[PDB]
Design a binder for this molecule. Sequence first.
Ligand SMILES: COC(=O)c1c(OC)cc2cc3c(c(O)c2c1C)C(=O)[C@]1(OC)C(=O)C=C(OC)[C@@H](O)[C@]1(O)C3=O
Ligand SMILES: [K+]
Ligand SMILES: [K+]
Ligand SMILES: [K+]
Ligand SMILES: [K+]
Ligand SMILES: [K+]
Ligand SMILES: [K+]
Ligand SMILES: [K+]
Ligand SMILES: [K+]
Ligand SMILES: [K+]
Ligand SMILES: [K+]
Ligand SMILES: [K+]
Ligand SMILES: [K+]
Ligand SMILES: [K+]
Ligand SMILES: [K+]
Ligand SMILES: [K+]
Ligand SMILES: [K+]
Ligand SMILES: [K+]
Ligand SMILES: [K+]
Ligand SMILES: [K+]
Ligand SMILES: [K+]
Ligand SMILES: [K+]
Ligand SMILES: [K+]
Ligand SMILES: [K+]
Ligand SMILES: [K+]
Ligand SMILES: [K+]
Ligand SMILES: [K+]
Ligand SMILES: [K+]
Ligand SMILES: [K+]
Ligand SMILES: [K+]
Ligand SMILES: [K+]
Ligand SMILES: [K+]
Ligand SMILES: [K+]
Ligand SMILES: [K+]
Ligand SMILES: [K+]
Ligand SMILES: [K+]
Ligand SMILES: [Mg+2]
Ligand SMILES: [Mg+2]
Ligand SMILES: [Mg+2]
Ligand SMILES: [Mg+2]
Ligand SMILES: [Mg+2]
Ligand SMILES: [Mg+2]
Ligand SMILES: [Mg+2]
Ligand SMILES: [Mg+2]
Ligand SMILES: [Mg+2]
Ligand SMILES: [Mg+2]
Ligand SMILES: [Mg+2]
Ligand SMILES: [Mg+2]
Ligand SMILES: [Mg+2]
Ligand SMILES: [Mg+2]
Ligand SMILES: [Mg+2]
Ligand SMILES: [Mg+2]
Ligand SMILES: [Mg+2]
Ligand SMILES: [Mg+2]
Ligand SMILES: [Mg+2]
Ligand SMILES: [Mg+2]
Ligand SMILES: [Mg+2]
Ligand SMILES: [Mg+2]
Ligand SMILES: [Mg+2]
Ligand SMILES: [Mg+2]
Ligand SMILES: [Mg+2]
Ligand SMILES: [Mg+2]
Ligand SMILES: [Mg+2]
Ligand SMILES: [Mg+2]
Ligand SMILES: [Mg+2]
Ligand SMILES: [Mg+2]
Ligand SMILES: [Mg+2]
Ligand SMILES: [Mg+2]
Ligand SMILES: [Mg+2]
Ligand SMILES: [Mg+2]
Ligand SMILES: [Mg+2]
Ligand SMILES: [Mg+2]
Ligand SMILES: [Mg+2]
Ligand SMILES: [Mg+2]
Ligand SMILES: [Mg+2]
Ligand SMILES: [Mg+2]
Ligand SMILES: [Mg+2]
Ligand SMILES: [Mg+2]
Ligand SMILES: [Mg+2]
Ligand SMILES: [Mg+2]
Ligand SMILES: [Mg+2]
Ligand SMILES: [Mg+2]
Ligand SMILES: [Mg+2]
Ligand SMILES: [Mg+2]
Ligand SMILES: [Mg+2]
Ligand SMILES: [Mg+2]
Ligand SMILES: [Mg+2]
Ligand SMILES: [Mg+2]
Ligand SMILES: [Mg+2]
Ligand SMILES: [Mg+2]
Ligand SMILES: [Mg+2]
Ligand SMILES: [Mg+2]
Ligand SMILES: [Mg+2]
Ligand SMILES: [Mg+2]
Ligand SMILES: [Mg+2]
Ligand SMILES: [Mg+2]
Ligand SMILES: [Mg+2]
Ligand SMILES: [Mg+2]
Ligand SMILES: [Mg+2]
Ligand SMILES: [Mg+2]
Ligand SMILES: [Mg+2]
Ligand SMILES: [Mg+2]
Ligand SMILES: [Mg+2]
Ligand SMILES: [Mg+2]
Ligand SMILES: [Mg+2]
Ligand SMILES: [Mg+2]
Ligand SMILES: [Mg+2]
Ligand SMILES: [Mg+2]
Ligand SMILES: [Mg+2]
Ligand SMILES: [Mg+2]
Ligand SMILES: [Mg+2]
Ligand SMILES: [Mg+2]
Ligand SMILES: [Mg+2]
Ligand SMILES: [Mg+2]
Ligand SMILES: [Mg+2]
Ligand SMILES: [Mg+2]
Ligand SMILES: [Mg+2]
Ligand SMILES: [Mg+2]
Ligand SMILES: [Mg+2]
Ligand SMILES: [Mg+2]
Ligand SMILES: [Mg+2]
Ligand SMILES: [Mg+2]
Ligand SMILES: [Mg+2]
Ligand SMILES: [Mg+2]
Ligand SMILES: [Mg+2]
Ligand SMILES: [Mg+2]
Ligand SMILES: [Mg+2]
Ligand SMILES: [Mg+2]
Ligand SMILES: [Mg+2]
Ligand SMILES: [Mg+2]
Ligand SMILES: [Mg+2]
Ligand SMILES: [Mg+2]
Ligand SMILES: [Mg+2]
Ligand SMILES: [Mg+2]
Lengths: 5, 117, 150
Amino acid sequence: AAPQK
Amino acid sequence: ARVKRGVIARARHKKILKQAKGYYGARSRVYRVAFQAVIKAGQYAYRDRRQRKRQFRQLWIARINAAARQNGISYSKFINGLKKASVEIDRKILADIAVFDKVAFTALVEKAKAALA
Amino acid sequence: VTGSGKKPWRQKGTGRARSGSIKSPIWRSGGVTFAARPQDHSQKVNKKMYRGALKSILSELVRQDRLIVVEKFSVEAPKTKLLAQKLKDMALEDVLIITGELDENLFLAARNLHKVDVRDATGIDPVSLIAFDKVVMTADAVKQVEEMLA
RNA sequence: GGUUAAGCGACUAAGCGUACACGGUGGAUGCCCUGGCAGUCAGAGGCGAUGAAGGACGUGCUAAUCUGCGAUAAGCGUCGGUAAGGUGAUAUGAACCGUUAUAACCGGCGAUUUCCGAAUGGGGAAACCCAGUGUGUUUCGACACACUAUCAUUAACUGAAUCCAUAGGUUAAUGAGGCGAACCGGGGGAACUGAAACAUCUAAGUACCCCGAGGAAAAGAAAUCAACCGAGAUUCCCCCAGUAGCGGCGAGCGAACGGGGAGCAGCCCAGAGCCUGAAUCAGUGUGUGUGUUAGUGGAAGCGUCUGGAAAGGCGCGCGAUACAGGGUGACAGCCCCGUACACAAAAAUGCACAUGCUGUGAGCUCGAUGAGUAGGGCGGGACACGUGGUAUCCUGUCUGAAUAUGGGGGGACCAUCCUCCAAGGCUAAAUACUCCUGACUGACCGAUAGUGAACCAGUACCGUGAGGGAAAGGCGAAAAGAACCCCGGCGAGGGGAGUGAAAAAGAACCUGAAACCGUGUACGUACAAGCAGUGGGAGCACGCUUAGGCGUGUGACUGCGUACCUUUUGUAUAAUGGGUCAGCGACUUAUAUUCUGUAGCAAGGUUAACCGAAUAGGGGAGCCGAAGGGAAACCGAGUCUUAACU
RNA sequence: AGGACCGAACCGACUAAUGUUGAAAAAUUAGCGGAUGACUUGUGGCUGGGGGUGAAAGGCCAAUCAAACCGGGAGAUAGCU
RNA sequence: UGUAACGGGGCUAAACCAUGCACCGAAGCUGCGGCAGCGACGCUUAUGCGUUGUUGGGUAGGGGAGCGUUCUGUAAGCCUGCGAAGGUGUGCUGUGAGGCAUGCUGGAGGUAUCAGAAGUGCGAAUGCUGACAUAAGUAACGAUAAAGCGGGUGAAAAGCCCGCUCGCCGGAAGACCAAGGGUUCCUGUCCAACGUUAAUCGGGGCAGGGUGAGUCGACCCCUAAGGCGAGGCCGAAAGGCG
RNA sequence: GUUUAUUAAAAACACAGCACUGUGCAAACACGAAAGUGGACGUAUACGGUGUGACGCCUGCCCGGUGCCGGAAGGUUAAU
RNA sequence: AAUUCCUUGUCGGGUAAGUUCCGACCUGCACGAAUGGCGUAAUGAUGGCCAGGCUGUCUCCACCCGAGACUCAGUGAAAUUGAACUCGCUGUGAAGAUGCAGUGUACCCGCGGCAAGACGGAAAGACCCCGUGAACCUUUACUAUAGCUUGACACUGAACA
RNA sequence: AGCUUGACUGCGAGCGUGACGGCGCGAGCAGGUGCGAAAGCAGGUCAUAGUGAUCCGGUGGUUCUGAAUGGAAGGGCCAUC
Ligand SMILES: COC(=O)c1c(OC)cc2cc3c(c(O)c2c1C)C(=O)[C@]1(OC)C(=O)C=C(OC)[C@@H](O)[C@]1(O)C3=O
Ligand SMILES: [K+]
Ligand SMILES: [K+]
Ligand SMILES: [K+]
Ligand SMILES: [K+]
Ligand SMILES: [K+]
Ligand SMILES: [K+]
Ligand SMILES: [K+]
Ligand SMILES: [K+]
Ligand SMILES: [K+]
Ligand SMILES: [K+]
Ligand SMILES: [K+]
Ligand SMILES: [K+]
Ligand SMILES: [K+]
Ligand SMILES: [K+]
Ligand SMILES: [K+]
Ligand SMILES: [K+]
Ligand SMILES: [K+]
Ligand SMILES: [K+]
Ligand SMILES: [K+]
Ligand SMILES: [K+]
Ligand SMILES: [K+]
Ligand SMILES: [K+]
Ligand SMILES: [K+]
Ligand SMILES: [K+]
Ligand SMILES: [K+]
Ligand SMILES: [K+]
Ligand SMILES: [K+]
Ligand SMILES: [K+]
Ligand SMILES: [K+]
Ligand SMILES: [K+]
Ligand SMILES: [K+]
Ligand SMILES: [K+]
Ligand SMILES: [K+]
Ligand SMILES: [K+]
Ligand SMILES: [K+]
Ligand SMILES: [Mg+2]
Ligand SMILES: [Mg+2]
Ligand SMILES: [Mg+2]
Ligand SMILES: [Mg+2]
Ligand SMILES: [Mg+2]
Ligand SMILES: [Mg+2]
Ligand SMILES: [Mg+2]
Ligand SMILES: [Mg+2]
Ligand SMILES: [Mg+2]
Ligand SMILES: [Mg+2]
Ligand SMILES: [Mg+2]
Ligand SMILES: [Mg+2]
Ligand SMILES: [Mg+2]
Ligand SMILES: [Mg+2]
Ligand SMILES: [Mg+2]
Ligand SMILES: [Mg+2]
Ligand SMILES: [Mg+2]
Ligand SMILES: [Mg+2]
Ligand SMILES: [Mg+2]
Ligand SMILES: [Mg+2]
Ligand SMILES: [Mg+2]
Ligand SMILES: [Mg+2]
Ligand SMILES: [Mg+2]
Ligand SMILES: [Mg+2]
Ligand SMILES: [Mg+2]
Ligand SMILES: [Mg+2]
Ligand SMILES: [Mg+2]
Ligand SMILES: [Mg+2]
Ligand SMILES: [Mg+2]
Ligand SMILES: [Mg+2]
Ligand SMILES: [Mg+2]
Ligand SMILES: [Mg+2]
Ligand SMILES: [Mg+2]
Ligand SMILES: [Mg+2]
Ligand SMILES: [Mg+2]
Ligand SMILES: [Mg+2]
Ligand SMILES: [Mg+2]
Ligand SMILES: [Mg+2]
Ligand SMILES: [Mg+2]
Ligand SMILES: [Mg+2]
Ligand SMILES: [Mg+2]
Ligand SMILES: [Mg+2]
Ligand SMILES: [Mg+2]
Ligand SMILES: [Mg+2]
Ligand SMILES: [Mg+2]
Ligand SMILES: [Mg+2]
Ligand SMILES: [Mg+2]
Ligand SMILES: [Mg+2]
Ligand SMILES: [Mg+2]
Ligand SMILES: [Mg+2]
Ligand SMILES: [Mg+2]
Ligand SMILES: [Mg+2]
Ligand SMILES: [Mg+2]
Ligand SMILES: [Mg+2]
Ligand SMILES: [Mg+2]
Ligand SMILES: [Mg+2]
Ligand SMILES: [Mg+2]
Ligand SMILES: [Mg+2]
Ligand SMILES: [Mg+2]
Ligand SMILES: [Mg+2]
Ligand SMILES: [Mg+2]
Ligand SMILES: [Mg+2]
Ligand SMILES: [Mg+2]
Ligand SMILES: [Mg+2]
Ligand SMILES: [Mg+2]
Ligand SMILES: [Mg+2]
Ligand SMILES: [Mg+2]
Ligand SMILES: [Mg+2]
Ligand SMILES: [Mg+2]
Ligand SMILES: [Mg+2]
Ligand SMILES: [Mg+2]
Ligand SMILES: [Mg+2]
Ligand SMILES: [Mg+2]
Ligand SMILES: [Mg+2]
Ligand SMILES: [Mg+2]
Ligand SMILES: [Mg+2]
Ligand SMILES: [Mg+2]
Ligand SMILES: [Mg+2]
Ligand SMILES: [Mg+2]
Ligand SMILES: [Mg+2]
Ligand SMILES: [Mg+2]
Ligand SMILES: [Mg+2]
Ligand SMILES: [Mg+2]
Ligand SMILES: [Mg+2]
Ligand SMILES: [Mg+2]
Ligand SMILES: [Mg+2]
Ligand SMILES: [Mg+2]
Ligand SMILES: [Mg+2]
Ligand SMILES: [Mg+2]
Ligand SMILES: [Mg+2]
Ligand SMILES: [Mg+2]
Ligand SMILES: [Mg+2]
Ligand SMILES: [Mg+2]
Ligand SMILES: [Mg+2]
Ligand SMILES: [Mg+2]
Ligand SMILES: [Mg+2]
Ligand SMILES: [Mg+2]
Ligand SMILES: [Mg+2]
């Protein structure tokens, strides 16, 4: 999981 | 019947790696890289059999121009004179005579001048 | 191939090529892609083509002087040594013996001579006629072959 | 000759590159097979309360594991075979047994056969805990042995409410129970998928669950078909035929009649008399033939050369109903084990009979002829047949005949005709399969293949569990498996010595590739900018020589030159994919149909199943073709259209 | 007396830093909340997959949950790479 | 970001216009040699050769012809211990796939020719298995409770043993148990592997030893939640409930 | 008090209290092809469902639409 | 206003200065009465705002104490990787160049540091679109169906009005 | 404006336009008509839009078929919905 564009 | 590939595979790979001798690094050691190198070298070999013919004619002309001007005429006039004189000595020979037989070249130059005069 | 249908790893996220079975033919110990089955290789030959071919072979054996014809060919006892001498006297080897009726003594005597075969006139075949160097036929056998091939 | 100046300039290699020589690592390739795969011909088709399958724990001169066996424990008795050598394997050793018959080994028949497990005396966390009753011993402390589960059927004795009775209870006898690869019959019964979506339909009565049986099962002796002629139970194969039909008339599904074959078998109860126990078949005693379970004999060769070794080369012999196959120091008909062939069973046993005993009852005459059934209404299902005009079969529900002076069927229905007798039952063969046993075969595999397993593999290991599941073969002819010496830690490892044909075959062992890592030698390389090559090319080193010019290696300098695959209008692309090497890895197979090539026959061509001492021959049942037109009747080199054709 | 107050054991998990190929597939350090109750904990039992359980977050049901795992239908299908 | 609007140097022509003659310039065209396709016509074929004309970039894709691998027949033949297959160099040869000879290694197999059948050809599939690189002799060596010295043993001692100091826990980091594990316990011996280093040490390898009950616990008697359940009731079967 | 084990602890969930509604006991209701079991060894001051959410002052108008409750005349309407 | 778009509405308080906060106005885009309205002591690891105290949060950082980093000895990984002989600039170009063109600079090789670039590494984009893909959820979408409910027939009879 | 039903039945040389299914134009033949004295004209409308395949089912006719035979049902063919 990570911040997505 | 089942057919094992090992003997033929080795023979085919070994053929390519023999042509790659002398190439730097993996190009002479590893089949995947050597194959690309061997094919590219073959392309240059095909191409450069044509350039060879161009490069030498370029070289002969330069030497004829140098020797012609020592005798006081430019290449373009020198060649034109020989055509008028009906001399078919080609540029490969003129570049040879220009180096090894300077007195013979001078006679040719005077023959060209007489046709332009 | 023996092995469960369990998927080896999740479809995504592992960074590894996607796979669906351990039994895939791409894998070591996987199945054979087009695995063989027991099968029948026999072919049809038309009766007229079969009989037409035999006539051609027999005509060449004559034309090549390979066909020998005799009145009688028999041996008094099944002793193999007797047949071996008889053929040596004829200077025969690699010979096919065709007889119109089978003397059981002749059959037994030939059985250990691998360069020799004994056949009843009903049992001729295309390959034996071509494979043996000489063919010996009794006059009775010839007539039975003529009636057979018509 | 000296000094100064100017110009030009080799010898450096910390390391690196290319080539070559020699190694390491690693385990490809070749060769091999005591392991697999698919079959053919036979056998067997079960085991269990007389305690199974599968296990636990024991058992040796025995520390472990395997194999066997069970407190009588790698074994005991007896009958046979056989015997000069034996006491299973890793695996030696120790202590012994035996040699003309009581060593061992092989076969039949017996004995022993712990504990768990249907597990059965009760219980239970499998391999454990706890008893009751009755016999017998006793050393008075206790021992040994047998029996005691449940259900069904039958019998005896008991016995309520309830007088009789019945339900119930106790005891005895007989049977079942559980396991197992496929095949078989029945009860239930999906979805993915196809339909280019999807709901009828398909997949499919498939997968799967449950019940029951046998060596096979099921079916079976016309209330059947046919067509005015006739066939004659059931089952299986080839046609008929991808036809007639069914079908959101879509995708698809798909007969029968009739013909050719394999095999061939018919009977009994619904009932009395006559004649009796004649047919036939079940059990079981005996005998003959034959197969099985151990076996016996089983021919014929030496010289010389190479070699570590002869089975090979060369020379001269011999056997053969035996030249199948395997082994022996390299390839053996004659060295060995076998093979062809001829023989053998004390005992048990599968079949064929013959026959004893028990059970059965054959033949004749008269008579009878399967009712909540056939049929119907309603809802479903099976038939190729989806309710359709739908015959026929089954039945959940409600009804309901006639019964040989009668009923069923012939694809809605009616008439005539034909054909057959439902509502009771039994029955071999042709057919399906292979957990398992024996022999033999392969244009099957050969250690990343063949089984998951060539090896102590359903193991190690992983998961709570159901369950998943590996890797791992090769010294040599023979261990002759390296005495002894030296360095070293009374090491690891190594160097000699010795064995051997070989030790660079040394157990980390046949061959031993590539990636990858080194040591040495020749040349290049520290003022030089990029897909690393290509064309030209000096110099150097090493060899050859026609002696100034050839080969191999390197490559200063110089022209040209932005990897490969994929996908795209277009990629150096800064789009995808690949760290490299070695092994594996993707247009197959079966059956129909059409076209082309080629071969045979030709207005004809060809057989399928099957038979066959079997790639032959037989079998022409069928199929395509030589005639078309029409929806069809029908006509026919014509036909349809139309009243008729120009 | 008290779902009373402060605060250890015990139960929890509000903030920050560290760690993030970790000492650890959810921790440590310094602070933090409850702490006689709708408390906490040992042993045993019961509920099962369109089902359970849920002071309700689609949360939990063996490191897995808008339908667990294992085996089978099964080589489902893939006009896509 | 840096001359950055001739490619650069540079140019007063080395710019522009007009005329003219030379020369350079491509895989175009010509010359010389070789190969192959398609036509036409014949030394004459009998299916190939000769003369001549013309053609020969190529993806998707169509058509034609071949090489090589394993296996079956020819083959009880032929080659091979006077050295096969396989591995590794070299030379020759064909248009190519390839073929042939031979030095070294290896140590028992191979197979002509013509036919027959395919598990018949690999660089890619984030392909599968094994081996070996790179990063790199880099990060890290797991609580900041802490060590120092003398003597011993030993091939070798920061780490082992003994001693004296120092430090740390002390509602535990002490002591005894259950659950779980199953020989880790104690003694002798060894240091290959394991121990994040060395090791003489060890919970490591090897051999031997060690667990003693009328009173502790289990077993046993009695029951909870719950389980099973003769008959029974119910359910297509399997089973459910009691 | 409780909650998203593993990024959200809260204003969300629960709560005592309030209202509507169902249930006369072989209760309604739930799990079960069924037997049976829970509700409950309870009995309307009891039990189930729904909404609101201590306490204080309060909770106004609409029955046209959808739902529920009562009615039965007439129209229509299945098997039969 | 947890609701107000225009909107930092307007006015007042607080500050030198206040898009937040508090009070008030009512033009309520689009509050409102048990999917409750309006108050409310106590309580809360609850949201917002202000003040005292305190302070390295900060102006603006300095020094010190330990553990790493650094050197030496022993042991010894991993992500990644077509191959590399792996410079700047301007242009060109699948349109943002270490590799092309022109041009400038540059002896060969380490060690300690920093991260601007290698459209750096990790994950077959989770946003968007597509597929006659999937799942689960809703309803007066379609077709069914468990359950509930109606009637007829059966089990099911007698007499009378 | 008068008289009428050619808004006919069976065919059709030959063309145009569509991938196809299809769509369009048409002289002339046979039968039987209307107008015109006659030659002649008429197979709807100055032309180009006013429309929907197959399946399924309905209605009328018919010299076809009719599951043993004679019928019938059902099917075919023709017109039309
Ligand atoms: C715009 O927003 C984001 O850029 C963003 C993000 O920005 C901080 C953080 C996350 C974090 C996560 C996820 C995100 O999508 C995500 C996104 C999109 C997930 O979907 C998640 O990924 C394992 C998952 O599988 C299931 C979950 O909840 C159902 C999450 O809890 C999850 O576990 C998670 O950690
Ligand atoms: K050097
Ligand atoms: K090695
Ligand atoms: K044993
Ligand atoms: K049974
Ligand atoms: K379906
Ligand atoms: K589809
Ligand atoms: K769909
Ligand atoms: K029917
Ligand atoms: K009937
Ligand atoms: K192997
Ligand atoms: K394997
Ligand atoms: K060797
Ligand atoms: K090597
Ligand atoms: K160059
Ligand atoms: K690619
Ligand atoms: K693209
Ligand atoms: K990309
Ligand atoms: K792409
Ligand atoms: K074909
Ligand atoms: K408790
Ligand atoms: K589920
Ligand atoms: K060789
Ligand atoms: K690859
Ligand atoms: K390294
Ligand atoms: K050591
Ligand atoms: K909280
Ligand atoms: K909540
Ligand atoms: K509220
Ligand atoms: K209303
Ligand atoms: K209302
Ligand atoms: K009303
Ligand atoms: K609002
Ligand atoms: K709070
Ligand atoms: K960077
Ligand atoms: K008119
Ligand atoms: Mg990836
Ligand atoms: Mg395999
Ligand atoms: Mg035949
Ligand atoms: Mg013979
Ligand atoms: Mg050096
Ligand atoms: Mg070097
Ligand atoms: Mg080597
Ligand atoms: Mg029991
Ligand atoms: Mg018992
Ligand atoms: Mg579909
Ligand atoms: Mg079906
Ligand atoms: Mg039977
Ligand atoms: Mg013997
Ligand atoms: Mg012998
Ligand atoms: Mg040998
Ligand atoms: Mg009858
Ligand atoms: Mg009936
Ligand atoms: Mg039906
Ligand atoms: Mg009838
Ligand atoms: Mg009929
Ligand atoms: Mg091998
Ligand atoms: Mg294997
Ligand atoms: Mg397996
Ligand atoms: Mg385990
Ligand atoms: Mg040694
Ligand atoms: Mg020697
Ligand atoms: Mg050997
Ligand atoms: Mg070796
Ligand atoms: Mg230099
Ligand atoms: Mg310079
Ligand atoms: Mg594009
Ligand atoms: Mg380009
Ligand atoms: Mg790229
Ligand atoms: Mg790049
Ligand atoms: Mg790709
Ligand atoms: Mg990549
Ligand atoms: Mg409290
Ligand atoms: Mg919690
Ligand atoms: Mg804490
Ligand atoms: Mg606290
Ligand atoms: Mg508090
Ligand atoms: Mg407290
Ligand atoms: Mg518990
Ligand atoms: Mg939500
Ligand atoms: Mg979980
Ligand atoms: Mg689902
Ligand atoms: Mg399927
Ligand atoms: Mg698949
Ligand atoms: Mg500037
Ligand atoms: Mg220019
Ligand atoms: Mg010129
Ligand atoms: Mg040129
Ligand atoms: Mg040209
Ligand atoms: Mg050309
Ligand atoms: Mg071409
Ligand atoms: Mg061969
Ligand atoms: Mg040799
Ligand atoms: Mg071979
Ligand atoms: Mg060679
Ligand atoms: Mg292949
Ligand atoms: Mg490869
Ligand atoms: Mg490729
Ligand atoms: Mg690595
Ligand atoms: Mg580094
Ligand atoms: Mg460092
Ligand atoms: Mg460090
Ligand atoms: Mg430590
Ligand atoms: Mg010391
Ligand atoms: Mg220490
Ligand atoms: Mg202290
Ligand atoms: Mg131990
Ligand atoms: Mg100890
Ligand atoms: Mg160590
Ligand atoms: Mg130990
Ligand atoms: Mg005592
Ligand atoms: Mg029970
Ligand atoms: Mg709280
Ligand atoms: Mg959370
Ligand atoms: Mg939190
Ligand atoms: Mg609320
Ligand atoms: Mg109200
Ligand atoms: Mg009502
Ligand atoms: Mg203001
Ligand atoms: Mg305000
Ligand atoms: Mg509101
Ligand atoms: Mg309201
Ligand atoms: Mg308020
Ligand atoms: Mg170091
Ligand atoms: Mg480049
Ligand atoms: Mg260029
Ligand atoms: Mg450049
Ligand atoms: Mg650096
Ligand atoms: Mg940094
Ligand atoms: Mg990236
Ligand atoms: Mg994607
Ligand atoms: Mg589409
Ligand atoms: Mg008009
Ligand atoms: Mg009829």
